[PDB]
Design a protein around this motif. Structure first.
Motif, short mmCIF file in Angstrom:
data_model
loop_
_atom_site.label_atom_id
_atom_site.label_comp_id
_atom_site.label_asym_id
_atom_site.label_seq_id
_atom_site.Cartn_x
_atom_site.Cartn_y
_atom_site.Cartn_z
N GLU A 93 0.80 -1.23 0.00
CA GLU A 93 0.00 0.00 0.00
C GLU A 93 0.83 1.28 0.00
O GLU A 93 0.57 2.21 -0.79
CB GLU A 93 -0.95 0.01 1.20
N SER A 94 1.83 1.37 0.88
CA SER A 94 2.62 2.61 0.94
C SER A 94 3.31 2.87 -0.42
O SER A 94 3.47 4.01 -0.86
CB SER A 94 3.65 2.58 2.06
N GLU A 95 3.72 1.81 -1.09
CA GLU A 95 4.37 2.00 -2.37
C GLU A 95 3.36 2.48 -3.43
O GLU A 95 3.74 3.20 -4.36
CB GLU A 95 5.07 0.72 -2.80
N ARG A 96 2.09 2.10 -3.27
CA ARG A 96 1.01 2.54 -4.16
C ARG A 96 0.69 4.05 -4.08
O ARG A 96 0.47 4.71 -5.10
CB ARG A 96 -0.26 1.74 -3.88
N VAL A 97 0.65 4.59 -2.87
CA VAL A 97 0.34 6.01 -2.68
C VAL A 97 1.46 6.84 -3.31
O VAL A 97 1.25 7.88 -3.93
CB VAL A 97 0.20 6.37 -1.21
N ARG A 98 2.66 6.31 -3.13
CA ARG A 98 3.89 6.90 -3.60
C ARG A 98 3.93 6.86 -5.12
O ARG A 98 4.22 7.88 -5.75
CB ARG A 98 5.06 6.13 -2.99
N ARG A 99 3.64 5.71 -5.72
CA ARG A 99 3.71 5.61 -7.16
C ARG A 99 2.57 6.41 -7.76
O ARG A 99 2.73 6.99 -8.82
CB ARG A 99 3.71 4.15 -7.63
N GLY A 100 1.45 6.53 -7.06
CA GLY A 100 0.37 7.41 -7.48
C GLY A 100 0.80 8.88 -7.55
O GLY A 100 0.49 9.58 -8.51
N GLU A 101 1.50 9.35 -6.53
CA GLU A 101 1.98 10.72 -6.51
C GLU A 101 3.01 10.96 -7.60
O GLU A 101 3.01 11.99 -8.21
CB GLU A 101 2.59 11.07 -5.16
N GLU A 102 3.89 10.00 -7.81
CA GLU A 102 4.86 10.08 -8.89
C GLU A 102 4.19 10.14 -10.26
O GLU A 102 4.62 10.90 -11.12
CB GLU A 102 5.82 8.90 -8.83
N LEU A 103 3.14 9.37 -10.47
CA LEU A 103 2.45 9.46 -11.74
C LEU A 103 1.84 10.85 -11.87
O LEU A 103 1.99 11.50 -12.91
CB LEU A 103 1.38 8.37 -11.85
N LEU A 104 1.17 11.31 -10.82
CA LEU A 104 0.56 12.65 -10.88
C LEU A 104 1.62 13.71 -11.28
O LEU A 104 1.41 14.54 -12.18
CB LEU A 104 -0.10 12.97 -9.53
N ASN A 105 2.78 13.66 -10.64
CA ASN A 105 3.79 14.67 -10.87
C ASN A 105 4.34 14.59 -12.27
O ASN A 105 4.63 15.61 -12.90
CB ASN A 105 4.95 14.51 -9.89
N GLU A 106 4.51 13.36 -12.75
CA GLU A 106 5.05 13.16 -14.09
C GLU A 106 4.08 13.74 -15.10
O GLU A 106 4.47 14.44 -16.02
CB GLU A 106 5.31 11.68 -14.39
N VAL A 107 2.79 13.46 -14.94
CA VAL A 107 1.80 13.99 -15.88
C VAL A 107 1.84 15.52 -15.83
O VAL A 107 1.84 16.16 -16.86
CB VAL A 107 0.39 13.45 -15.60
N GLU A 108 1.95 16.10 -14.64
CA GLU A 108 2.01 17.56 -14.50
C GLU A 108 3.23 18.17 -15.19
O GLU A 108 3.20 19.33 -15.56
CB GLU A 108 2.03 17.98 -13.01
N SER A 109 4.31 17.41 -15.32
CA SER A 109 5.46 17.93 -16.05
C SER A 109 5.32 17.85 -17.57
O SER A 109 6.19 18.35 -18.27
CB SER A 109 6.74 17.23 -15.64
N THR A 110 4.25 17.28 -18.08
CA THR A 110 4.05 17.23 -19.52
C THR A 110 3.19 18.40 -19.98
O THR A 110 2.54 19.06 -19.17
CB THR A 110 3.41 15.91 -19.97
N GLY A 111 3.22 18.68 -21.29
CA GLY A 111 2.51 19.84 -21.84
C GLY A 111 1.19 19.48 -22.47
O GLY A 111 0.92 18.32 -22.79
N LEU A 112 0.33 20.48 -22.62
CA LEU A 112 -0.99 20.28 -23.20
C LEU A 112 -1.42 21.60 -23.84
O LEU A 112 -1.75 22.54 -23.14
CB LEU A 112 -1.96 19.82 -22.11
#
Ligand SMILES: [Cl-]
Ligand code: NA
Ligand code: NA
Length: 443
Positions: A93-112
Protein backbone atom coordinates in the motif's frame (compact mmCIF):
# COMPACT_ATOMS: atom_id res chain seq x y z
CA UNK A 1 -18.11 32.92 -28.39
CA UNK A 2 -16.18 35.80 -26.70
CA UNK A 3 -13.33 35.44 -24.21
CA UNK A 4 -14.63 35.23 -20.68
CA UNK A 5 -13.70 37.91 -18.15
CA UNK A 6 -11.38 35.38 -16.61
CA UNK A 7 -9.72 34.74 -19.97
CA UNK A 8 -9.36 38.56 -20.39
CA UNK A 9 -7.57 38.63 -17.05
CA UNK A 10 -5.21 35.93 -18.37
CA UNK A 11 -4.48 38.09 -21.48
CA UNK A 12 -2.99 40.65 -19.11
CA UNK A 13 -0.27 37.98 -18.45
CA UNK A 14 0.26 36.85 -22.04
CA UNK A 15 3.83 37.30 -23.20
CA UNK A 16 2.76 37.57 -26.88
CA UNK A 17 4.18 35.84 -29.94
CA UNK A 18 7.77 36.13 -28.87
CA UNK A 19 9.58 32.88 -29.69
CA UNK A 20 8.59 31.39 -26.33
CA UNK A 21 5.45 29.27 -26.00
CA UNK A 22 4.85 30.12 -22.32
CA UNK A 23 2.33 31.60 -19.91
CA UNK A 24 -1.43 31.09 -19.75
CA UNK A 25 -1.89 30.31 -23.46
CA UNK A 26 1.10 28.00 -23.49
CA UNK A 27 1.12 24.20 -22.99
CA UNK A 28 2.11 24.25 -19.30
CA UNK A 29 -0.89 26.28 -18.10
CA UNK A 30 -2.87 23.24 -17.05
CA UNK A 31 -4.55 21.76 -14.02
CA UNK A 32 -4.07 18.13 -12.94
CA UNK A 33 -5.95 15.91 -10.55
CA UNK A 34 -5.76 12.31 -9.40
CA UNK A 35 -8.34 9.88 -8.07
CA UNK A 36 -7.77 6.51 -6.39
CA UNK A 37 -10.12 3.93 -8.02
CA UNK A 38 -11.31 0.76 -6.27
CA UNK A 39 -13.03 -1.87 -8.40
CA UNK A 40 -12.66 -3.52 -11.77
CA UNK A 41 -12.15 -1.27 -14.80
CA UNK A 42 -12.95 -1.96 -18.44
CA UNK A 43 -10.35 0.25 -20.11
CA UNK A 44 -12.04 0.42 -23.49
CA UNK A 45 -15.29 1.60 -21.91
CA UNK A 46 -13.46 4.15 -19.77
CA UNK A 47 -11.88 5.54 -22.95
CA UNK A 48 -15.28 5.81 -24.60
CA UNK A 49 -16.60 7.60 -21.51
CA UNK A 50 -13.77 10.11 -21.78
CA UNK A 51 -14.90 10.81 -25.35
CA UNK A 52 -18.44 11.23 -23.92
CA UNK A 53 -17.32 13.80 -21.36
CA UNK A 54 -15.59 15.90 -24.01
CA UNK A 55 -18.70 15.83 -26.21
CA UNK A 56 -20.71 16.81 -23.12
CA UNK A 57 -18.72 19.95 -22.22
CA UNK A 58 -18.02 22.58 -24.92
CA UNK A 59 -15.29 24.20 -22.84
CA UNK A 60 -13.29 20.97 -23.33
CA UNK A 61 -13.48 21.43 -27.11
CA UNK A 62 -12.91 25.22 -27.18
CA UNK A 63 -9.47 25.93 -28.58
CA UNK A 64 -7.89 29.36 -28.29
CA UNK A 65 -5.76 30.51 -31.22
CA UNK A 66 -3.67 33.66 -31.60
CA UNK A 67 -5.31 36.19 -33.87
CA UNK A 68 -4.53 39.90 -34.24
CA UNK A 69 -2.78 40.35 -30.89
CA UNK A 70 -5.37 38.38 -28.87
CA UNK A 71 -6.98 34.93 -28.68
CA UNK A 72 -10.03 33.71 -30.56
CA UNK A 73 -12.13 30.89 -29.07
CA UNK A 74 -13.45 28.27 -31.45
CA UNK A 75 -15.72 25.40 -30.42
CA UNK A 76 -14.59 22.27 -32.28
CA UNK A 77 -15.97 18.76 -32.76
CA UNK A 78 -14.53 16.34 -30.15
CA UNK A 79 -11.31 14.65 -31.18
CA UNK A 80 -10.61 10.88 -30.96
CA UNK A 81 -11.29 9.34 -27.57
CA UNK A 82 -7.87 8.57 -26.03
CA UNK A 83 -6.60 6.89 -22.87
CA UNK A 84 -3.10 6.02 -21.80
CA UNK A 85 -2.71 3.07 -19.38
CA UNK A 86 0.33 2.07 -17.37
CA UNK A 87 1.00 -1.00 -15.28
CA UNK A 88 2.37 0.62 -12.04
CA UNK A 89 2.94 -2.73 -10.34
CA UNK A 90 1.32 -4.98 -7.76
CA UNK A 91 3.07 -3.40 -4.77
CA UNK A 92 2.30 -2.87 -1.06
CA UNK A 93 0.00 0.00 0.00
CA UNK A 94 2.62 2.61 0.94
CA UNK A 95 4.37 2.00 -2.37
CA UNK A 96 1.01 2.54 -4.16
CA UNK A 97 0.34 6.01 -2.68
CA UNK A 98 3.89 6.90 -3.60
CA UNK A 99 3.71 5.61 -7.16
CA UNK A 100 0.37 7.41 -7.48
CA UNK A 101 1.98 10.72 -6.51
CA UNK A 102 4.86 10.08 -8.89
CA UNK A 103 2.45 9.46 -11.74
CA UNK A 104 0.56 12.65 -10.88
CA UNK A 105 3.79 14.67 -10.87
CA UNK A 106 5.05 13.16 -14.09
CA UNK A 107 1.80 13.99 -15.88
CA UNK A 108 2.01 17.56 -14.50
CA UNK A 109 5.46 17.93 -16.05
CA UNK A 110 4.05 17.23 -19.52
CA UNK A 111 2.51 19.84 -21.84
CA UNK A 112 -0.99 20.28 -23.20
CA UNK A 113 -1.66 22.88 -25.91
CA UNK A 114 -4.69 25.18 -25.96
CA UNK A 115 -4.29 25.83 -29.70
CA UNK A 116 -5.70 22.45 -30.71
CA UNK A 117 -7.44 19.44 -29.19
CA UNK A 118 -7.19 17.69 -26.90
CA UNK A 119 -7.85 20.01 -23.98
CA UNK A 120 -8.27 17.03 -21.60
CA UNK A 121 -6.11 13.93 -21.33
CA UNK A 122 -6.20 10.93 -19.03
CA UNK A 123 -3.60 8.53 -17.77
CA UNK A 124 -4.69 5.42 -15.85
CA UNK A 125 -2.07 3.79 -13.63
CA UNK A 126 -3.19 0.29 -12.58
CA UNK A 127 -1.72 -1.61 -9.70
CA UNK A 128 -3.83 -4.74 -10.11
CA UNK A 129 -7.26 -5.69 -11.45
CA UNK A 130 -9.10 -3.75 -8.71
CA UNK A 131 -6.82 -0.85 -7.67
CA UNK A 132 -5.67 2.11 -9.84
CA UNK A 133 -4.89 5.81 -9.95
CA UNK A 134 -6.63 7.92 -12.61
CA UNK A 135 -4.86 11.17 -13.56
CA UNK A 136 -6.63 13.87 -15.48
CA UNK A 137 -5.02 16.91 -17.03
CA UNK A 138 -6.81 19.82 -18.61
CA UNK A 139 -5.83 23.19 -19.91
CA UNK A 140 -6.44 25.73 -17.18
CA UNK A 141 -8.12 28.18 -19.60
CA UNK A 142 -10.74 25.43 -19.95
CA UNK A 143 -11.17 24.17 -16.36
CA UNK A 144 -10.68 25.23 -12.77
CA UNK A 145 -10.64 23.01 -9.62
CA UNK A 146 -14.44 22.88 -9.40
CA UNK A 147 -14.61 21.91 -13.07
CA UNK A 148 -12.15 19.04 -12.49
CA UNK A 149 -14.44 17.66 -9.75
CA UNK A 150 -17.36 17.86 -12.26
CA UNK A 151 -15.33 16.15 -15.03
CA UNK A 152 -14.42 13.22 -12.79
CA UNK A 153 -18.02 12.83 -11.59
CA UNK A 154 -19.44 12.97 -15.07
CA UNK A 155 -16.77 10.60 -16.42
CA UNK A 156 -17.31 7.85 -13.88
CA UNK A 157 -21.10 8.21 -14.15
CA UNK A 158 -21.06 7.95 -17.96
CA UNK A 159 -18.66 4.96 -17.62
CA UNK A 160 -20.99 3.21 -15.18
CA UNK A 161 -23.98 3.76 -17.43
CA UNK A 162 -22.08 2.25 -20.41
CA UNK A 163 -21.24 -0.73 -18.23
CA UNK A 164 -24.93 -1.07 -17.37
CA UNK A 165 -24.46 -0.33 -13.67
CA UNK A 166 -26.87 1.77 -11.65
CA UNK A 167 -26.22 5.51 -11.50
CA UNK A 168 -28.57 8.48 -11.37
CA UNK A 169 -29.04 10.64 -14.45
CA UNK A 170 -26.67 13.54 -14.92
CA UNK A 171 -28.32 16.95 -15.00
CA UNK A 172 -28.19 18.79 -18.33
CA UNK A 173 -25.24 21.13 -18.01
CA UNK A 174 -25.09 24.77 -18.87
CA UNK A 175 -22.23 25.38 -21.32
CA UNK A 176 -19.44 27.84 -20.56
CA UNK A 177 -20.55 30.02 -23.51
CA UNK A 178 -23.82 30.56 -21.73
CA UNK A 179 -21.88 31.82 -18.70
CA UNK A 180 -19.73 34.08 -20.85
CA UNK A 181 -23.02 35.64 -22.03
CA UNK A 182 -24.58 35.84 -18.62
CA UNK A 183 -21.57 37.52 -16.98
CA UNK A 184 -21.59 40.31 -19.58
CA UNK A 185 -25.31 40.90 -18.94
CA UNK A 186 -24.58 41.04 -15.25
CA UNK A 187 -21.80 43.57 -15.87
CA UNK A 188 -24.38 46.10 -17.06
CA UNK A 189 -26.50 45.79 -13.90
CA UNK A 190 -27.01 48.88 -11.69
CA UNK A 191 -25.14 47.42 -8.68
CA UNK A 192 -22.01 47.47 -10.81
CA UNK A 193 -21.67 51.24 -10.67
CA UNK A 194 -22.25 51.07 -6.90
CA UNK A 195 -19.52 48.41 -6.56
CA UNK A 196 -17.06 50.36 -8.74
CA UNK A 197 -17.53 53.36 -6.45
CA UNK A 198 -16.92 51.10 -3.44
CA UNK A 199 -13.64 49.79 -4.90
CA UNK A 200 -12.30 53.18 -6.03
CA UNK A 201 -12.68 54.32 -2.41
CA UNK A 202 -11.59 51.09 -0.77
CA UNK A 203 -8.46 50.69 -2.87
CA UNK A 204 -7.50 54.36 -2.95
CA UNK A 205 -3.71 54.40 -2.91
CA UNK A 206 -3.57 50.66 -2.47
CA UNK A 207 -0.78 48.60 -4.00
CA UNK A 208 -0.83 44.79 -4.01
CA UNK A 209 2.09 43.73 -1.81
CA UNK A 210 5.15 42.51 -3.72
CA UNK A 211 7.62 39.78 -2.73
CA UNK A 212 11.25 40.55 -3.47
CA UNK A 213 12.56 38.04 -5.97
CA UNK A 214 15.95 36.33 -5.94
CA UNK A 215 16.43 36.76 -9.67
CA UNK A 216 15.31 39.88 -11.54
CA UNK A 217 12.87 39.93 -14.37
CA UNK A 218 15.60 41.46 -16.58
CA UNK A 219 17.89 38.42 -16.18
CA UNK A 220 15.55 36.77 -18.70
CA UNK A 221 15.88 33.20 -17.42
CA UNK A 222 13.58 30.63 -19.05
CA UNK A 223 10.07 30.40 -17.64
CA UNK A 224 9.28 27.58 -15.25
CA UNK A 225 7.10 26.99 -12.22
CA UNK A 226 7.99 24.77 -9.28
CA UNK A 227 5.69 23.64 -6.52
CA UNK A 228 6.34 22.74 -2.88
CA UNK A 229 3.65 20.63 -1.23
CA UNK A 230 2.67 20.72 2.41
CA UNK A 231 -0.02 19.51 4.80
CA UNK A 232 -1.36 21.00 7.94
CA UNK A 233 -0.70 18.35 10.59
CA UNK A 234 -3.69 16.87 12.45
CA UNK A 235 -2.86 18.63 15.75
CA UNK A 236 -2.40 22.02 14.01
CA UNK A 237 -5.36 21.36 11.68
CA UNK A 238 -7.60 20.63 14.65
CA UNK A 239 -6.44 23.82 16.41
CA UNK A 240 -7.19 25.90 13.29
CA UNK A 241 -10.69 24.41 12.93
CA UNK A 242 -11.51 24.86 16.63
CA UNK A 243 -10.19 28.44 16.71
CA UNK A 244 -12.17 29.33 13.63
CA UNK A 245 -15.39 27.70 14.80
CA UNK A 246 -15.22 29.55 18.11
CA UNK A 247 -14.32 32.87 16.40
CA UNK A 248 -17.13 32.43 13.88
CA UNK A 249 -14.59 32.78 11.04
CA UNK A 250 -13.91 30.21 8.29
CA UNK A 251 -10.65 28.20 8.45
CA UNK A 252 -9.61 30.02 5.30
CA UNK A 253 -9.96 33.44 6.92
CA UNK A 254 -7.72 32.23 9.76
CA UNK A 255 -5.04 30.92 7.38
CA UNK A 256 -5.27 34.13 5.29
CA UNK A 257 -4.94 36.23 8.47
CA UNK A 258 -1.81 34.27 9.37
CA UNK A 259 -0.43 35.06 5.88
CA UNK A 260 -0.99 38.75 6.52
CA UNK A 261 0.83 38.46 9.82
CA UNK A 262 3.68 36.74 7.98
CA UNK A 263 3.88 39.48 5.34
CA UNK A 264 3.82 42.16 8.00
CA UNK A 265 6.72 40.44 9.70
CA UNK A 266 8.54 39.98 6.35
CA UNK A 267 7.96 43.45 4.81
CA UNK A 268 7.15 45.78 7.70
CA UNK A 269 3.86 46.83 6.04
CA UNK A 270 0.61 47.28 8.02
CA UNK A 271 -1.61 48.34 5.10
CA UNK A 272 -1.77 45.00 3.36
CA UNK A 273 -3.38 44.20 0.05
CA UNK A 274 -3.21 40.55 -1.10
CA UNK A 275 -5.35 39.02 -3.82
CA UNK A 276 -7.22 35.78 -3.53
CA UNK A 277 -9.12 33.91 -6.23
CA UNK A 278 -12.80 33.63 -5.54
CA UNK A 279 -14.67 30.58 -6.86
CA UNK A 280 -16.63 32.77 -9.33
CA UNK A 281 -19.62 30.38 -9.11
CA UNK A 282 -22.18 32.39 -7.16
CA UNK A 283 -24.78 31.62 -9.85
CA UNK A 284 -25.96 28.05 -9.21
CA UNK A 285 -27.17 27.67 -12.83
CA UNK A 286 -23.48 26.94 -13.58
CA UNK A 287 -22.61 24.34 -10.88
CA UNK A 288 -22.46 21.46 -13.39
CA UNK A 289 -20.56 23.66 -15.90
CA UNK A 290 -17.01 23.00 -17.08
CA UNK A 291 -14.98 26.15 -17.48
CA UNK A 292 -12.58 28.39 -15.54
CA UNK A 293 -14.71 30.68 -13.37
CA UNK A 294 -12.22 31.83 -10.77
CA UNK A 295 -11.81 35.58 -10.19
CA UNK A 296 -8.82 37.60 -8.94
CA UNK A 297 -10.13 39.46 -5.89
CA UNK A 298 -8.08 42.01 -3.96
CA UNK A 299 -8.33 41.91 -0.16
CA UNK A 300 -7.11 45.04 1.61
CA UNK A 301 -6.79 45.02 5.39
CA UNK A 302 -5.31 47.55 7.79
CA UNK A 303 -3.40 45.79 10.54
CA UNK A 304 -2.33 48.97 12.29
CA UNK A 305 -3.32 49.09 15.94
CA UNK A 306 -4.10 45.34 16.08
CA UNK A 307 -3.62 43.98 19.59
CA UNK A 308 -3.87 40.28 18.81
CA UNK A 309 -4.06 37.67 16.14
CA UNK A 310 -7.77 37.44 16.93
CA UNK A 311 -8.20 41.06 15.85
CA UNK A 312 -6.34 40.37 12.57
CA UNK A 313 -8.80 37.53 11.84
CA UNK A 314 -11.81 39.70 12.67
CA UNK A 315 -10.59 42.50 10.34
CA UNK A 316 -9.97 39.87 7.70
CA UNK A 317 -13.57 38.70 8.10
CA UNK A 318 -14.80 42.22 7.56
CA UNK A 319 -12.58 42.68 4.46
CA UNK A 320 -13.71 39.34 3.01
CA UNK A 321 -17.34 40.17 3.66
CA UNK A 322 -17.37 43.44 1.76
CA UNK A 323 -15.12 42.05 -1.02
CA UNK A 324 -17.58 39.31 -1.89
CA UNK A 325 -20.56 41.69 -1.56
CA UNK A 326 -19.01 44.01 -4.12
CA UNK A 327 -17.19 41.43 -6.14
CA UNK A 328 -16.37 42.37 -9.72
CA UNK A 329 -14.61 40.63 -12.59
CA UNK A 330 -11.06 41.85 -12.12
CA UNK A 331 -10.55 42.85 -15.79
CA UNK A 332 -13.40 45.36 -15.28
CA UNK A 333 -12.24 46.50 -11.84
CA UNK A 334 -8.56 47.16 -12.54
CA UNK A 335 -9.03 50.09 -14.94
CA UNK A 336 -10.80 51.84 -12.02
CA UNK A 337 -7.73 51.37 -9.81
CA UNK A 338 -5.01 51.33 -12.47
CA UNK A 339 -1.90 51.45 -10.20
CA UNK A 340 -2.97 48.51 -8.00
CA UNK A 341 -0.48 46.11 -9.61
CA UNK A 342 2.52 48.42 -9.98
CA UNK A 343 4.61 45.70 -8.22
CA UNK A 344 3.67 42.89 -10.58
CA UNK A 345 6.01 43.80 -13.36
CA UNK A 346 8.75 45.28 -11.31
CA UNK A 347 12.22 44.01 -11.99
CA UNK A 348 12.80 42.88 -8.43
CA UNK A 349 9.34 41.92 -7.16
CA UNK A 350 6.35 39.72 -7.90
CA UNK A 351 2.88 39.59 -6.54
CA UNK A 352 1.59 36.68 -4.51
CA UNK A 353 -1.88 35.22 -4.34
CA UNK A 354 -3.35 33.28 -1.40
CA UNK A 355 -6.30 31.09 -2.37
CA UNK A 356 -8.60 28.42 -1.10
CA UNK A 357 -9.38 25.76 -3.66
CA UNK A 358 -13.06 25.90 -4.52
CA UNK A 359 -14.55 22.50 -5.18
CA UNK A 360 -17.87 20.88 -4.28
CA UNK A 361 -18.05 19.36 -0.78
CA UNK A 362 -17.00 15.71 -0.40
CA UNK A 363 -16.40 13.65 2.70
CA UNK A 364 -14.97 10.26 1.98
CA UNK A 365 -14.97 7.98 -1.03
CA UNK A 366 -17.70 8.42 -3.66
CA UNK A 367 -19.29 5.72 -5.80
CA UNK A 368 -20.36 5.45 -9.41
CA UNK A 369 -21.87 2.08 -10.19
CA UNK A 370 -19.31 -0.56 -9.28
CA UNK A 371 -16.43 1.95 -8.99
CA UNK A 372 -15.44 3.79 -5.81
CA UNK A 373 -13.33 6.92 -6.38
CA UNK A 374 -11.52 9.20 -3.94
CA UNK A 375 -9.74 12.43 -4.80
CA UNK A 376 -6.02 12.34 -3.92
CA UNK A 377 -5.52 15.67 -2.09
CA UNK A 378 -2.52 14.88 0.08
CA UNK A 379 0.60 15.51 -1.93
CA UNK A 380 4.06 15.51 -0.41
CA UNK A 381 6.23 15.25 -3.50
CA UNK A 382 7.50 18.57 -4.73
CA UNK A 383 7.68 19.41 -8.43
CA UNK A 384 10.63 21.09 -10.11
CA UNK A 385 8.69 22.01 -13.28
CA UNK A 386 4.91 21.80 -13.29
CA UNK A 387 1.69 23.67 -13.91
CA UNK A 388 2.45 27.24 -14.94
CA UNK A 389 1.94 30.33 -12.79
CA UNK A 390 1.78 33.17 -15.36
CA UNK A 391 3.67 35.73 -13.22
CA UNK A 392 3.79 35.44 -9.46
CA UNK A 393 3.69 33.31 -6.34
CA UNK A 394 0.64 31.22 -5.59
CA UNK A 395 -0.49 29.65 -2.32
CA UNK A 396 -3.22 27.09 -2.92
CA UNK A 397 -4.93 25.57 0.15
CA UNK A 398 -7.43 22.69 0.05
CA UNK A 399 -9.51 22.63 3.23
CA UNK A 400 -11.05 19.26 3.84
CA UNK A 401 -14.47 18.75 5.50
CA UNK A 402 -12.83 16.07 7.67
CA UNK A 403 -10.72 18.83 9.19
CA UNK A 404 -7.49 18.30 7.25
CA UNK A 405 -5.60 20.64 4.90
CA UNK A 406 -3.31 20.14 1.95
CA UNK A 407 -1.34 22.98 0.43
CA UNK A 408 0.89 24.00 -2.45
CA UNK A 409 3.30 26.87 -2.79
CA UNK A 410 4.15 27.57 -6.40
CA UNK A 411 6.69 30.02 -7.76
CA UNK A 412 8.55 30.81 -10.96
CA UNK A 413 12.03 29.26 -10.96
CA UNK A 414 13.26 32.08 -13.19
CA UNK A 415 12.63 34.41 -10.21
CA UNK A 416 12.94 32.39 -7.00
CA UNK A 417 15.32 29.83 -5.62
CA UNK A 418 13.81 26.74 -3.97
CA UNK A 419 15.47 27.49 -0.63
CA UNK A 420 13.91 30.94 -0.40
CA UNK A 421 10.45 29.46 -0.91
CA UNK A 422 11.20 26.58 1.47
CA UNK A 423 12.02 29.13 4.21
CA UNK A 424 8.95 31.18 3.31
CA UNK A 425 6.70 28.12 3.73
CA UNK A 426 8.34 27.09 6.99
CA UNK A 427 7.92 30.66 8.34
CA UNK A 428 4.23 30.56 7.43
CA UNK A 429 3.58 27.25 9.21
CA UNK A 430 5.33 28.59 12.31
CA UNK A 431 3.34 31.88 12.26
CA UNK A 432 0.09 29.91 11.89
CA UNK A 433 0.91 27.54 14.75
CA UNK A 434 1.78 30.33 17.14
CA UNK A 435 -1.20 32.43 16.14
CA UNK A 436 -3.89 29.83 16.92
CA UNK A 437 -2.05 28.64 20.04
CA UNK A 438 -2.01 32.17 21.51
CA UNK A 439 -4.63 34.15 19.54
CA UNK A 440 -5.24 36.81 22.20
CA UNK A 441 -1.57 37.56 22.90
CA UNK A 442 0.05 40.77 21.53
CA UNK A 443 0.99 40.39 17.87
CL1 LIG B 1 -8.54 26.50 -9.87
NA1 NA C 1 -4.24 20.52 -26.92
NA1 NA D 1 -22.29 -4.77 -13.84
Amino acid sequence: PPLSFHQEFLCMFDSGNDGADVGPFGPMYHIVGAWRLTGGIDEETLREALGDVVVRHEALRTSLVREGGTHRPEILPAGPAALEVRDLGDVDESERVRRGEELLNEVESTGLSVRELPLLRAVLGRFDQKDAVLVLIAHHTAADAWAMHVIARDLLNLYAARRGNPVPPLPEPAQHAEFARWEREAAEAPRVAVSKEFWRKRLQGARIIGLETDIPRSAGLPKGTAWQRFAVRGELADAVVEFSRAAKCSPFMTMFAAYQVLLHRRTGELDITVPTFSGGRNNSRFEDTVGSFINFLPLRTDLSGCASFREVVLRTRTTCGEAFTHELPFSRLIPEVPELMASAASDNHQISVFQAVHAPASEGPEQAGDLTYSKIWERQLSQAEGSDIPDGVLWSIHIDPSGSMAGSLGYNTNRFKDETMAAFLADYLDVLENAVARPDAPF
